[PDB]
Symmetry: none
Subunit: 79 residues, 23 copies
Amino acid sequence: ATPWSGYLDDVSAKFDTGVDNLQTQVTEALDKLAAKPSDPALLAAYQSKLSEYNLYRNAQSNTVKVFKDIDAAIIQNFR
Amino acid sequence: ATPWSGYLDDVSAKFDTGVDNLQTQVTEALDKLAAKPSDPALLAAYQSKLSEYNLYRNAQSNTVKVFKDIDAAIIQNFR
Amino acid sequence: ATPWSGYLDDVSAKFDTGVDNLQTQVTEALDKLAAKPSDPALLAAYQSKLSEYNLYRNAQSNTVKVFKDIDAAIIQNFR
Amino acid sequence: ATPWSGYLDDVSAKFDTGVDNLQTQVTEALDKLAAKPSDPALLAAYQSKLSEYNLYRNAQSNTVKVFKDIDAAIIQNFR
Amino acid sequence: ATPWSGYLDDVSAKFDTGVDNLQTQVTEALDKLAAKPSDPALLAAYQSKLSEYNLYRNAQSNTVKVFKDIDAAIIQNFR
Amino acid sequence: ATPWSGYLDDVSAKFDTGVDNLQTQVTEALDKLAAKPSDPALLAAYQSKLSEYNLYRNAQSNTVKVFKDIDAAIIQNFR
Amino acid sequence: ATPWSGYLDDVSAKFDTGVDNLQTQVTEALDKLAAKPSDPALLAAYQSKLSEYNLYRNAQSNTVKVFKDIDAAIIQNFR
Amino acid sequence: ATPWSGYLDDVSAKFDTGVDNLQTQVTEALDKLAAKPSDPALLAAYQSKLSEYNLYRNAQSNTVKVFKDIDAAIIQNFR
Amino acid sequence: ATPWSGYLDDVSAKFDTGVDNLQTQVTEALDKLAAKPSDPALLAAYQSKLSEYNLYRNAQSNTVKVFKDIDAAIIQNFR
Amino acid sequence: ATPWSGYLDDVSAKFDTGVDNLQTQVTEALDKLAAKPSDPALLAAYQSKLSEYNLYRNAQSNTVKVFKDIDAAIIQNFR
Amino acid sequence: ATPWSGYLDDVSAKFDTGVDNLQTQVTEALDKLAAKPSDPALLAAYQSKLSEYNLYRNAQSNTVKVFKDIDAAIIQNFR
Amino acid sequence: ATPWSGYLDDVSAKFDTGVDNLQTQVTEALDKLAAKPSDPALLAAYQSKLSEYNLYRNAQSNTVKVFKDIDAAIIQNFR
Amino acid sequence: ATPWSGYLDDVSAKFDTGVDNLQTQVTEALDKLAAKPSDPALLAAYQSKLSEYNLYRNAQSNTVKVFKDIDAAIIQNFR
Amino acid sequence: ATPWSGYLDDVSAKFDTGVDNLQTQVTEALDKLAAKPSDPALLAAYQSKLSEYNLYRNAQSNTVKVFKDIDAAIIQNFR
Amino acid sequence: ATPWSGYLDDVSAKFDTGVDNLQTQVTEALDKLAAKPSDPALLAAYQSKLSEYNLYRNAQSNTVKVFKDIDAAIIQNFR
Amino acid sequence: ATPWSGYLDDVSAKFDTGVDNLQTQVTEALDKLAAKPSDPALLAAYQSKLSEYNLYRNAQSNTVKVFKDIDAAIIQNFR
Amino acid sequence: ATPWSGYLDDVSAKFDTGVDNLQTQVTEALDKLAAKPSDPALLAAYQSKLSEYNLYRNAQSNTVKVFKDIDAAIIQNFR
Amino acid sequence: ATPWSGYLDDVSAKFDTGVDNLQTQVTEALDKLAAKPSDPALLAAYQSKLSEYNLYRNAQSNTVKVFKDIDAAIIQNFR
Amino acid sequence: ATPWSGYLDDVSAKFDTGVDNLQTQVTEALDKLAAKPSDPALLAAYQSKLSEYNLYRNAQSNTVKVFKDIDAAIIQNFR
Amino acid sequence: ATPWSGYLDDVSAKFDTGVDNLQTQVTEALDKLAAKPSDPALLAAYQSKLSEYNLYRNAQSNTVKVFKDIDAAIIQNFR
Amino acid sequence: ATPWSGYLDDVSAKFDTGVDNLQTQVTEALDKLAAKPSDPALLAAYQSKLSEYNLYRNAQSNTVKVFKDIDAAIIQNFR
Amino acid sequence: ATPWSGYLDDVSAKFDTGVDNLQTQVTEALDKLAAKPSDPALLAAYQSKLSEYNLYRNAQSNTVKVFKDIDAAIIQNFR
Amino acid sequence: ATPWSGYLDDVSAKFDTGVDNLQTQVTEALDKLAAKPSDPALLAAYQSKLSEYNLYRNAQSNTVKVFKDIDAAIIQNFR
C-alpha cells in the first residue's frame, strides 16, 4: 500500500526524482572536504555541488507555491 | 401498470428528462475530486457541473410553483 | 350489501377514484423525506405531490358545494 | 448502531474519506519539524502538506454551503 | 395513557422522529466547540450540524402551515 | 341533578369532549413560551397547538349553525 | 380599583410579564454602548439583547392577531 | 435573584464560559508588551493571544445570528 | 452517443479548445526541467508556459461564474 | 353537426380564439428550455410566454364569472 | 403569416431590437479571446462587451416583470 | 305596423333607449381585448364598460319587477 | 356625435385627462433606453416615469371599483 | 454603417483615442530593443513607454468597471 | 408649455438641480485625463469627481423608491 | 311654489342637509388628486373623504327602506 | 365658517396635528441634502426623518381603515 | 325622571355597562400614540385596545338584531 | 419651543450626545495633519480618530434601521 | 460664480491648500537638478522634496476613499 | 474636564504611556548627533534609539487596526 | 490548574518545546562573547546560534498565521 | 503544423530572434577558451560575450513578467 499523495506532492516528487542523487553527492562532498579544507579540487567540486543544490531548492519551492495559488482561486468562485 | 401522474408531475418529469444524466455526472465528478482535491482540471469540471445543477433545480421549482398558483385561482371562481 | 350512497357521495367518489393513489403517494413521500430532509430530489418530489394533493382537495369541495346549492333551490319551489 | 447522518454530513464525509490520511500526515510532519527547524527537506515536506491541507478545508466548506443554499430555496416554495 | 394528539401534531412528530438525534448532536457539537474555538475539525462538524438543523426546522414549519391552510378551507364550505 | 341541555348543546359537547385536553395544552404551551420566546422547540409546539385550536373552534361553530338552520325551516311549515 | 382588561389584553400582559425586565435591560445596554461604541463586550451584549427584544415583539403581535381572528368568526355565525 | 436570560443569551454565555480567562490573558499580554515592544517572546505570545481572541469573537457572533434567523422564521408562520 | 453538455460546459469547452495543447506543453516543460534545474533556456521556457497556464485558468473560471450569475437572476423573476 | 354551445361558452371561445397559438408556443418553449436550462435567450423567451399565459387565463376566468353573476340575478326576479 | 405576439413580447422585442448585434458581438469576442487569452486588447474588448450584455439582460427582465405585475392587479378588480 | 307593447315593455324600452350604444361598445371592447390581453389601456376600458353594463342590467330588472308588483295588488281588490 | 359615456367612464376619463401625456412620455423613454441600456441619466428618467405610470394605474382602478360598489348597493334596496 | 456601440464602449474609446499612438510606439520600441539589448538610450525609451502603457491600461479598466457598477444598481430599483 | 411632471419627477429634479454642474464636470475631467493618464493632479481630481457622482446617483435612486413604496400602500387601503 | 315632497323625501333631505358640502368636497378632492397621483397628503385626504361618502350613502338608503317597510304593513291591515 | 368634517376626518386630523411639523422638516432636510449629497450628518438626519414620515403615514392609513370597517358593519344590521 | 327605555335598549346598555371604560381607554391610547408613532409599547397597547373595541361592537350589534328578529315573528302570529 | 422629535430621532440623538465632541476632534485633527503630512504623531492621532468616527457612524445607522423594522411590523397587524 | 464643490472635493482642497507650494517647489527642484545631476546639495534637496510629495499624495487619496466608503453605507440603509 | 476618549484611543494611550520618554530621547539623540556626525558612541546610541522608535510605531498601528477590524464585524450582524 | 490554551497556542507550544534550550543557549553565547569580542571560536558559535534562532522564529510565526487564516474562512460560511 | 503559441511566448520569441546567434557564439567562445585559459584575446572576447548574454537574459525575463502582471489585473475585474 502507498500513503496518500496529491498534486502538489506529485510536483515535489517530480523535482526530487529528476534531481536523483544530488543530496547524497552533496553529503559526500562535504564529508570529503571537512577532512582537508585546503585541497583546491575539493573546494571546486564542493562549490559546484552547493550551487546546484541551492538552485534546485529555490525552483521547487516557487513552483509549488505558484500552483497552490492558482488552485486557491478557482475554489473561491464556488459561491 | 404505471402509478398516477398529474400535470405538475409531468412538468417536473419534463425537466428531469430534458436534463438526463446531470445527476450521475455530478456524483462522478465529486467522487473523482474527493480523491485529489488539488487537480485544477478536476476543480474546473466540478465547478461547471455544480453550477448547472444549481440552475436546473431553481428553474424547475419556480416553474412548478407558478403553474400551481395559476391553477389554484380558477378553482376559487367555482362559487 | 353496500351502504347507502347518494349523488353528492357519488361525485365525491368520482373525484376520489379519478385520483386513485395520490394519498398513498403523499404518505410515502413524507415518510421518505422525514428521514433525510436535505436531499434535493426528495424535496422536489414532495413539493410536487403536496401541490397536487392541495389542488385536488379544493376542487372536490367546491364542486360538492355547488351541486348542493343547485339542489336546495328547486326544493324551495315546492310551496 | 450508527448515529444519524444526513446529506450534508455525507458530503463532508465523502471529502474526509477521499482525503484519508492527510490529518495524520500533517501532524507527523509538524512533529518532525519542531525538533529541527533548519532541515530543508523537512521544510519542503511541511510546506507541501500544509498547502494540501488548506486547499482541502476550503473546498469542503464551500461545497457544503452551496448545497445548503440550494436546499433552502426549494423549501420556501412550499407556501 | 397518552395525551391528545391530532393530525398536525402527528406530522410534526413524524418530522421530529425521522430526524431523531440531531438536537443532541447539535448540543454536543456546540459544547465541544465552545471549549476550543480554533480547531478546524470542530468548526467543520459544527457548520454541517447547524445547517442540517436549520433546514429541518424550516421544512417542518412550512409543511405544518400548508396542511393547516388546506384544512381551514373545506370547513368554510359548511355554510 | 343536571341542568337542561338540548340538541345543539349536545353537539357542542360532543366536540368539546372529543377534543378533551386541548384547552389546557394550549394554556400550558403559552405559559412555557412566554418565559423564553426564543426556544425553537417551544415555538414549534406552540404553532402546532394554536393551529389545532383554531381548526376545532371553526368546525364546531359551523356545525352548530348548520343544524340550527336545518331546524328553523321545518318549523315554518307548521302554518 | 383596576381599569378594564379583556382577553387580548390578558394575553399581551402574559407576554409582557413572562418577559419581565427586558425593556430596562435593553435601555441600559444602549445607554452603556452609546458612551463607548468600540468595546466588543458591549457590542456583543447589545446584539444579544436587541435580538431577544425583536423576537418577543414579533411573537406577541402574531399571537394577539391570531386570537382576534379566531374570535371574529364565531360572532358572524349569530345570524 | 438572577436577572432575566433567554436562549441567545445562554448561547453567548456558553461561549463566554467555555473561553474563560482569555480576556484577562489578552489584557495582561498587552500590558506586558507595551513596556518593552522589542522582546520577541512577548511579541509571539501577544500574536497568539490576539488571534485566539479574534476567532472567538467572530464565531460567537455568527452563531448567535444564525439561531436568531432560525427563530424569526417559525414565528411568521403563525398567520 | 455524446453525454449531456449545457451552456456553461460549452463555454468551458470553448476555452479548453481554443487553448488546445497548453496542458501537454506544460507537462513536457516540467518533465524536461526537473532533470536539469540549471539550464537557463529551460528556465525561461518553463516560466513562459507557467504564466500562460495561470492566465488561462483564471479567465476561464471568471467567465463561467459571470454567466452563471447572469442566469440565476432571470429565473428569480418567474414568481 | 356541432355540439351545443351557449353564451358563456361563446365568451370562453372568443378568448381562446383571440389568443390562438399561445398554448402550443408555451409547450414548445418549455420543450426547448428543458434540454438546456442555461441559455439566457431561452430563459427570456420562456419568461415572456409564461407571463402572457398567466394573464390570459386569469382574465378569461374573471370575465366568465362576472357574466354568470349578472345572469343569475335577473332570473331570481321571476317570482 | 406571423405567430401570435402580445404586449410583454412586444416589450421584450423592443429591447432585443434596440440592442441589435450585441449577441453576435459577444460571441465573436469570446471566439477571438479563447485562441489567445493573453492579448490585453482582446481582454479589454471582451470585458466591455460582457458588461454591456449583463446590463441589458437585467434591465429587460426587470421591465417585463414590472409590466406584468401592473397588469395582474387591474384584473383582480373585475369581481 | 308595430307589434303589441304594454307598460312594462315601455319601461324596459325607456331603459334600453336611454342606454343606446352600450351593448355594441361592450362587444367591441371585448373583441379588441381578446386579441391582446396585456394592454393596460384595453384592460381599463373593458373594466369601465363591463361595470356600466352590470349596473344598467340590475337597475332595469329591479324597476320592472317593482312596477309589476305595484300592479298585481290593485287587481286583487276587484273582488 | 359622441358615443355613450356614463359616470364610471367619466371618472376614468377624469384620471386619463388629468394625467395627459404620461403614456407618450413612457413610450418615448423606453424607446430611448432600449438603444443604450447603460446611460445613467436614461435609467433614472425611465425609473421615475415607470413609477408614476404604476401609481396612476392603481389609483384609477381602485377608485372606479369603489364607486361601482357604492352604486350596486342602493339598487338592491329597490325590493 | 457603424456597428453598435454603447456607453461603456464610448468610455473605452475615449481612452483609446486620447492615447492615440502609444500601441504602435511600444511595438516599435520593442522591435528596436530586441536587436541590440545593450544600448542605454533604447533601454530608457523602452522603460518610459512600458510604464505609460501599464498606467493607461489600469486606468481604463478601473473606470469602465466603476461605471458598470454604478449602472447595475439603479436597475435593481425597478422592482 | 411644459410637459407633465409629477411628484417623483419633482424629487428627481430637486436632486438634479441641487447637483447642478457635476455631469459636465465629470465629462470634462475624463476628457482631460484620457489625454495624459499619468498626471497625479488629474488623477486626484478625477477620483474626487467620480466619487461624488456615485454617491449622488445612489442617494437619488433610493429616495425615489422609498417615496414610491410609501405611496403604493395608502392606495391599497381604498378597498 | 315648492314641488311635492313626502315623508321619505323629508328623511332623504334631512340626511342630504345634515351632510351639506360633502359632495363638493369629494369632487374637489378627486379633481386635485387626478393631477398629481403621488402626493401622500392628497392621497390621505381623498381616502378620508371617500370613506365618509360611502358611509353616508349606505346609512341613508337603509333608513329610507326601513321606514318604507314599516309603512307598507299598517296599510295591509285596512282589509 | 368651517367646512364639513366627520369622524374619520377627525381621526386623520388628530394624527396630522399630533405630528405637527414633520412635513416641513422632511422638506427642509431634503432641500439641504440635495445640495451636498456627501455630508454624513445630513445623511443621518435625512434617514431619521424619512423613517419617521414612513411610520406615521402607515399608522394613519391603517387606523382610518379599521374604523371605517367597524362602521360599515353596524349599518348592515338595519335590515 | 328617566327617559323611556325598552328591552333592546336594555340589552345594548348591558353591553355598554359590562364594557365600562373601553371608550375612554381607546381615546387616550390614540391620543398618546398620535404624538409619537414609533414607540413599540404604545403600538402594542393601541393594537390590543383597538381589537377589543372591534369585537365588542360586533357582538353587541349581532345580539340586538337576533333579539329583534325573534320578536318580530311572534307578532305576525296575531292574525 | 422645540421642534418635533420622535423615537428614532431620540435614538440618533442618544448616539450623537454619547459621542459628544468627536466631530470637532476629527475636524481639528485633519486641519493639523493637512499642514504637515509627515509627522508620525499626527498620523497616529488621525488614524485613531478616523477609526472611532467610522465605527460610531455604522453603529448608529444599524440601530436606527433595526428599530424602524421592528416598528413597521406591528402596524401591519392592524388589519 | 464658483463651480459646484461637494464634501470629498472640500477634503481634497483642504489637503491641497494645507500643502500650498509643494508642487511648484518640486518642479523647480527637478528643473535645477536636471542641469547638473552631480551637485550633492541639489541631490539632497530633491530627495527631501520628492519624499514629501509622495507622502502627501498617499495620505490625500486614502482619506478621500475612507470618507466615501463611510458615506456609501448609510445610503444603503434607506430601504 | 477631560475630552472624549474611546477604546482605540485607550489602546493608543496604553502604548504611548508604556513607552514614556522615547520621543524626547530620540529628539535629544539627534540633537547631539547633528553637531558631531563622527563620534562612534553617538552613532551607536542613535542607531539603538531609532530602531526602538520604529518597532514601537509599527506595533502600535497594527494593534489599533486589528481591534478596529474586530469591531466592525459584530456591527454588521445587527441586520 | 492550567490556564486556558487553544489550538494556535498548542502549535506555538509545540514549536517552543521542540526547540527546548535554544533561548538559554543564545543568551549564554552572547554573555560569553561580550567579554572577549575577538575569539574566533566564540564568534563562530554565536553565528551558528543566532542563525538557528532566526530560522525558528520565522517558521513559528508563518505557521501560526497560516492556520489562523485557514480557520477564519470556514466561519464566514456560517451565513 | 505549428504548436500553440500565445502572447508571452511571442514576446519571448521576439527576444530570442532579435538576439539570433548569441547562444552559439557563447558556446564557441567557451570551447575555445577552455583549451588555452591564458590568451588575453580569448579572455576579452569571452568577457564581452558573457556580459551580453547576461543582459539579454535579465531583460527578457523582466519584460515577460511585467506583461503577465498587466494581464492578470484586467481579468480580476470580470466579477
